[PDB]
């Protein structure tokens with residue numbers, strides 16, 4: 725069945741790992757253990773298709789940009805995670821997207837904007853500005869909590885759906901031809 729290369733990106737401490745672990749292992753990591761680079765696979769059924777999810781869980785801050793370039797090249801789809809009580813992490817999304825587009829040398833890259841930690845009262849990034857940004861990029865926005873698991877499956881499943889749409893659009897192309 726179809727394999728999907730997903731990459732989870734975002735600033736230090738937004739909950740990239742907690743989201744990924746909730747997805748894979750169904751528990752919430754309460755600790756803060758900074759990531760170098762972790763990879764996971766989960767077989768799931770999404771819209772009646774069996775998917776092999778190959779998930780890359782990236783570091784909050786890359787020491788070597790070459791390490792960032794590589795996962796942006798390999799990734800088929802990107803989970804762009806910010807925390808709703810971390811304004812800078814939300815601002816960092818623009819910079820991730822620019823870096824990904826440049827590396828892919830393309831304007832069309834499957835991504836989903838993820839506002840994590842929605843269980844907190846400390847919200848400094850409002851939903852509207854998140855929604856506005858996602859609308860601007862033409863990608864989905866999903867609010868999640870790794871603590872409660874709210875929205876976690878949805879975030880990953882939606883990314884898979886985005887990758888499918890892209891594959892279809894890339895077969896049909898926009899020009900240079902073609903496919904139906």
Ligand SMILES: Nc1nc2c(ncn2[C@@H]2O[C@H](COP(=O)(O)OP(=O)(O)CP(=O)(O)O)[C@@H](O)[C@H]2O)c(=O)[nH]1
Nearest residue numbers: 737738739740741742754758759784841869870871
């Ligand atoms: N309240 C709440 N806390 C969360 C949530 N997700 C993660 N955390 C907490 O935030 C801290 C960092 O989470 P972690 O998943 O390691 O974030 P990360 O972005 O992977 C860290 P790095 O960028 O170094 O790899 C941990 O204390 C974790 O329990 C959430 O949805 N809600």
Ligand SMILES: [Mg+2]
Nearest residue numbers: 740741758759
């Ligand atoms: Mg991590």
Ligand SMILES: [Mg+2]
Nearest residue numbers: 734783784785
């Ligand atoms: Mg990062």
